[PDB]
Design a protein around this ligand. Sequence first.
Ligand code: HEM
Ligand code: HEM
Ligand SMILES: Nc1ccc(Br)cc1-c1nnc[nH]1
Ligand SMILES: Nc1ccc(Br)cc1-c1nnc[nH]1
Ligand SMILES: Nc1ccc(Br)cc1-c1nnc[nH]1
Ligand SMILES: Nc1ccc(Br)cc1-c1nnc[nH]1
Lengths: 373, 370
Amino acid sequence: SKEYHIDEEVGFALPNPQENLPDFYNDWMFIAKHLPDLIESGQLRERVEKLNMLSIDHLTDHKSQRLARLVLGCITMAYVWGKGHGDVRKVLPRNIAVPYCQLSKKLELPPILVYADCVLANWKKKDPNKPLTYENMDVLFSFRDGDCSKGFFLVSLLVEIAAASAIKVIPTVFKAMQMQERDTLLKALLEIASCLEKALQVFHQIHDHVNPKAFFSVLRIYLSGWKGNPQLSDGLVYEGFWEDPKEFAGGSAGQSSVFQCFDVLLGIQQTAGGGHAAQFLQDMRRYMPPAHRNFLCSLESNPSVREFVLSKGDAGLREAYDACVKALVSLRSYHLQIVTKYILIPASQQGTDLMNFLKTVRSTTEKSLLKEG
Amino acid sequence: SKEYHIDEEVGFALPNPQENLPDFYNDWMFIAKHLPDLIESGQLRERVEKLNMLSIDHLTDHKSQRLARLVLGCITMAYVWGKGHGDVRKVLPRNIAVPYCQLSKKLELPPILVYADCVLANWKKKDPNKPLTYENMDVLFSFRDGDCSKGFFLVSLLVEIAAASAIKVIPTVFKAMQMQERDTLLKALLEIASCLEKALQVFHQIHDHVNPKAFFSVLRIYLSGWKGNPQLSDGLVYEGFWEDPKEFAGGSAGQSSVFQCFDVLLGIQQTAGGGHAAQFLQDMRRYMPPAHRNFLCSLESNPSVREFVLSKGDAGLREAYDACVKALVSLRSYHLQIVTKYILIPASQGTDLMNFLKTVRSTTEKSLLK
Ligand code: HEM
Ligand code: HEM
Ligand SMILES: Nc1ccc(Br)cc1-c1nnc[nH]1
Ligand SMILES: Nc1ccc(Br)cc1-c1nnc[nH]1
Ligand SMILES: Nc1ccc(Br)cc1-c1nnc[nH]1
Ligand SMILES: Nc1ccc(Br)cc1-c1nnc[nH]1
C-alpha cells in the first residue's frame, strides 16, 4: 500500500516505539514515569507546576514526538483527574499546555490522550528477538498501581496486531475485483475473515490481565475526557495557547482504524446516517493520526465490494463475504459480553445509552450479512 | 486527475447540465417548471399527492439522474415549506418519497436539495457559442417569482468556475514537490493565488442580481433543511422508506468542493481542532457528490504543501504560499461583509452564524507564514 504508515507486521501501531526522550526533556519523563507514586502522595500537580516551559524544537523525528505526545498526554490526565475521585483542575498549566498543543498541532491530533498514544505508541518488546507475545511485551506508562493499564493497553495492541494481518490482504481484494478474478477474491475474503477470527481469540486474554473493579473505578477515570462531562462542563483551558476552554473526547477504541476499516471495506456503513452511533465513529476519526484517517477515506474511494459480491449470484463468494461479516459480529458480540463484565456489573456494586450504541453498531453489522437471515 | 469528474472548463460543476428528462417523467417536470405558480396557487401539495409512484429505472445516464434529483429536490423543498411562511408538511408523500430516496441512494447523496443540485447542475447557456458569463446564462428552476434564485445560483456558479482555473494547477504543485522543482512550484502557487483573486472579483456581481429583501425572507427559507430546526424538530418522514423521520441539513456552499479543496491544499485545517466549524465542514462532505469527496480525501492523502514551504526557508516560496492564503482571507472577509448585508440587517427589520465564518476566516489568517 501507499505510505499510510502501515507497518507490515504491526500494522497501525507504531513499530518499535521510542522509549526515552532527549535528556533535554528529562523533567517531563520523570513525572510521566512516576505517575502512580506522585499522585497518591499528593505531589503531582505541584511537580508539573514547577516545570520549565521546554521547547518542541528538540523533538527531531516522528517516533520522538509521539513519545513526547504520550508523555504529555498521560501527565495531562494525571493533572486534570488528580487522585481520581473528584478533586479536578480545569486549567492546564502553561509550562505543560503550550508544548502539548504545539506538538499536537504538528501531529494533527487534539491535545488529549488518544488510542494512538496509550496503545499504538505505548509498548515495548522486552526481548527484541522473541515474538510479539504478551509475556515478551510491556507498557511504557501507567496512571496508578493496580490500574491494569498494562493488560488493557497490551491486549488491545495484540488484538489490533491480529486484525492487522488482514490489512495486507485488502490490496488483493480490490485488484481481484478490478481484474475480475473470482477465485482469488474468494480466498482473499476467506483469509480476511481468518485474521478477524484470530483477533477474537486474542481478545479472550483480557480476562487474565484486566480486573473489573480496577478498570472501572481506576483506569476508566484516567481515560475520561472533557466533552459532555459535567465535571468539566465547558472543557479544559489550555493556558498560554487558547483563551476559552476547549472540549475533546476521552480515549476510545473507536479511534482505531482497523476496527473502523473493516466496516468500510465490507460496505458496512457505520458512519452513514445522522444517528448518534454514526456521528460518534465519524468523530473519532479526527482522533486518529492523519495518515490513518486518510486510509479510511481512501477505502471509501474504492468501489463497493459488498455490491460486487451481491451483483454476481455466487454462493461461494457470498459465503466468503459473509465469513468476514460474521467475524465482525462475533467480535462485537463477545465485546458486549465484556463491557457487561467490566462496566455494567461494577456499576451496580457501588449507562444504557452505552449498550444501545454497541447493540446498534452490532445490529448494523448483522444486517449486513447476505445469508443466514 | 483521472475521473474525479472534474471538467477542464467548468470544474466541479456538471458540464452542460441536461435540461429535460424523458417524457415518462413529464409529471415530475411539470411541477418542477411550475413551482412559482403552483405554490402561490396553493395547488402544489396536492399535485404532488396525486402523482403516481414513478420508477427511476428509465433514468439512464448520470446527467439524467442528476437533474431528476434536481427536479425532485425542488419539489420536496416546496412541499415541505409551501408558501414559505411557517406551515410545514412533516411527511413526504410516498409516491415522491421513495423515487427520490433510491435515486439519492444510487448517487450516494442524502435525500435533500443541496449545492450540487441547485447550483452545479442547475444552469444552462443561453447562446451555446458565447462565453460562460452571467448575461449568457440562466438557471433551470426557481421557487417563487422575484426570489432572485437566478442571481444567487449563477454568481455562486460563476465564482465556482473562476476557482476551477486553479484546480488545473494542483497536479503541478504536487509533482513539483516530489521532483523538487522549486521554480515551477512558485509560479504554480502564484497562478493559484491569481485565480482566487479573479474569484473575488466575480463575486462582486452579487450585489447586482440578488436583493436582501428577497434572499432573507424568501430564498433562504426554501433552501433550509430539517436538522437542528425547530420547525421540523425530529426531521422528515420519508413515507414508504423509513418509518422514523430522518433529519438532513439544509443547502450551503460549504457543500462545495472547490472551497474546501483550497483549505486542504494549503494545509489550512478548518476540519481540525474539534471546533464547531471543523465538524460542519466535514459533515458537509457527505452532502457532496462521491467523486468530489473522493477528490478531496485524496488531496489530504498527499504531503502538505504548507510544510514543504516551511522546510525550505525560501522567501520566494513563502511569499507565493502567502499570496494564496491571503486570497482566501479576503474572499472570506468580503464574504463576511455580504452576510452582514443579506442576513443580519435584514434580520434587524443569527450571531452564532458569523462566529462560524470569523473562526473559519481567522484560521485562514493564522496560516499565513510571515
Ligand atoms: C475492559 C474492557 C473493555 C471495556 C469495558 C470496553 C468498553 C467499551 C465502551 C464503553 C465502548 C463505547 C465506545 C466509547 O465509549 O468510546 C466500546 C466500544 C468499542 N470497543 Fe471496547 N471496551 C473494552 C475492551 C476493548 C478492547 C480490548 C478492544 C480491542 C479491539 C475494544 C474495541 C472496541 C471498539 C472498536 C469499539 C467501537 C465500537 C465498534 O467499533 O464496534 N474494546 N467499548
Ligand atoms: C447573499 C449571499 C450569501 C449569503 C447570505 C451567505 C451566507 C453564508 C452563511 C450564513 C454561511 C455559514 C454556513 C451556513 O450557515 O451554511 C456561509 C458560508 C459559506 N459561504 Fe456563503 N453566503 C452567500 C453567498 C455565497 C456565495 C455566492 C458563495 C460562492 C460559492 C459563498 C461561499 C460560502 C462558503 C464556501 C461557505 C462555507 C464556509 C467557508 O468555507 O468559508 N457564499 N455563507
Ligand atoms: N481497547 C482500548 C484501548 C485504549 C483505549 Br484509550 C480505549 C480502548 C477502548 N475499549 N473500548 C472502548 N475503548
Ligand atoms: N468492536 C470491534 C469492532 C471492530 C473490530 Br475489527 C474489532 C472490535 C473488537 N471489539 N472487541 C475486540 N475487538
Ligand atoms: N451560494 C450558495 C448557493 C446555493 C446554496 Br444551496 C447555498 C449557497 C451558500 N452560500 N453561502 C452559504 N450557502
Ligand atoms: N467563503 C469562501 C470560502 C472559500 C473560497 Br475558495 C471562496 C469563498 C467565497 N465565496 N464567495 C465569497 N467568498
